[PDB]
């Protein structure tokens, strides 16, 4: 069983590089963010452009959805995050306190909290309702590349150019684990596995790693793609076969068998670095997005 992703749609609209693409939890919407300071909403199934969300003064590097699919959060170079109501497009809150670009962001399953990672080397935790910063965590000693809450939002994982992945107790802000090899290339991305037992870490040594954080053991590695320059999103695809999906610096989307580490498909079509990929919650659908020479989002679909 290898997947057979075939190109359904090419989604044109962003005037600069696309930075991040995410599927709404209900699976009906695709949100995109871009260097053009814009968020755009697209139909997940027909690729129909829905709306443009604007307000940020500078480019956006990440966008995330609330559990109920009603809210988005964005992380911009203008040093802020904005909470948007998706149906009105209106900015509900502006989240002030980072002293440099906000790079990454995420809601917890509860969706009462936002986690943010910045070039100022901190991870912040914010209240959704009031927009106020609950905690500032001296998380790292270099730009924070990724922040992600576990299955129930009791933990946060952060990655950084400093070469570390760190696990944080959300409620208390206290660091529980630092993961470090005997060699520290920048960690360009991290997220929890759907079940919270593992973390998937990308490093700028063209390498993805599945870690048992609690024991500090690397269980799988995923290689063959190109990742030396950019903070590229990776995913666990769990709808059909059990895959790892990542963008790549060779204009390709890579798909690996989670257990064998075998490349099972490469998707061709983009004409620049695939910076971002997202896996549909229920359907075997992938969204991918590329950089400045491309600026498009592609939607793909497999049988498995």
């Amino acid at each position: 069983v290898k997947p057979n992703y075939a190109l359904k749609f090419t989604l044109a609209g962003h005037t600069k590089a696309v930075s991040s693409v995410k599927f709404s939890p209900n699976g009906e919407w695709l949100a995109s963010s871009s260097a053009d300071k814009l968020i755009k909403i697209w139909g997940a199934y027909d690729g129909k452009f829905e709306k443009t969300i604007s307000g940020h003064k500078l480019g956006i590097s990440d966008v995330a959805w609330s559990s109920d699919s009603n809210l988005l959060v964005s992380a911009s170079d203008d040093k802020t995050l904005k909470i948007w109501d998706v149906s009105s497009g209106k900015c509900l809150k502006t989240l002030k306190g980072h002293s440099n670009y906000v790079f990454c962001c995420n809601f917890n399953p509860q969706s009462n909290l936002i986690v943010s990672g910045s070039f100022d080397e901190s991870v912040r935790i914010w209240d959704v309702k009031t927009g106020k910063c609950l905690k500032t965590l001296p998380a790292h000693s270099d730009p924070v590349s990724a922040v992600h809450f576990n299955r129930d939002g009791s933990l946060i994982v952060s990655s950084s150019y400093d070469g570390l992945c760190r696990i944080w107790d959300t409620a208390s802000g206290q660091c529980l684990k630092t993961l470090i090899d005997d060699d520290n290339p920048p960690v360009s991305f991290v997220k929890f596995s759907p079940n919270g037992k593992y973390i998937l870490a990308a490093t700028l040594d063209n390498t993805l790693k599945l870690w048992d954080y609690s024991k500090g053991k690397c269980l799988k590695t995923y290689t063959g793609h190109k990742n030396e320059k950019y903070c590229i999103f990776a995913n666990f695809s769990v709808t059909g076969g059990k895959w790892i999906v990542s963008g790549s610096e060779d204009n390709l989307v890579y798909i690996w068998n989670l257990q064998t580490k075998e490349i099972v498909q490469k998707l061709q079509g983009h004409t620049d670095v695939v910076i971002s990929t997202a896996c549909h919650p229920t359907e075997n659908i992938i969204a991918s997005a590329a950089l400045e020479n491309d600026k498009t989002i592609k939607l793909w679909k497999s049988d498995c």
């Binding site: 590089a17 696309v18 930075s19 871009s34 590097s61 790079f103 070039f119 320059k229 950019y230 950089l291």
Partner: peptide, 5 residues
Amino acid sequence: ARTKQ
């Protein structure tokens, strides 16, 4: 920033 190295 993400879209630039």
